[PDB]
Design a protein around this ligand. Structure first.
Ligand SMILES: [Pd+2]
Length: 124
């Protein structure tokens, strides 16, 4: 019983660095975070910000989730994220990732008490 909230931390938080300073980054990180145990996860996003900052988004701009739910919120300022996308030559269990860096607003879905993120919906 890993909590969705802990699951969110494992899958999307990386405060430890302020930017994906490497092209290794995704390869390492996707494997490190167990996003390659069942299969190659096609796409994952990592957020280079404090946990409190990312949790604070849960009381920022309420916006429609991609699945039609009302429990998504958009960051007021941009955040340092790193998109990991799976390449063509990625074959499980040799999962390989094109690292990509940007500053975009994030959008997350929150739920629970305390009200915290359990899902990364999009960057904008
Ligand atoms: Pd903006």
């Amino acid at each position: 019983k890993e909590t969705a909230a802990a699951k969110f931390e494992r899958q999307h938080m990386d405060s430890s660095t302020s930017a994906a300073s490497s092209s290794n980054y995704c390869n390492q990180m996707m494997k490190s975070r167990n996003l390659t145990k069942d299969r190659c996860k096609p796409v994952n996003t990592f957020v280079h910000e404090s946990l409190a900052d990312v949790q604070a988004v849960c009381s920022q701009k309420n916006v429609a989730c991609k699945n039609g739910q009302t429990n998504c919120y958009q960051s007021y300022s941009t955040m340092s994220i790193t998109d990991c996308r799976e390449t063509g030559s990625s074959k499980y269990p040799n999962c390989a990732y094109k690292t990509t860096q940007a500053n975009k607003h994030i959008i997350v879905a929150c739920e629970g008490n305390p009200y915290v993120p359990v899902h990364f919906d999009a960057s904008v």
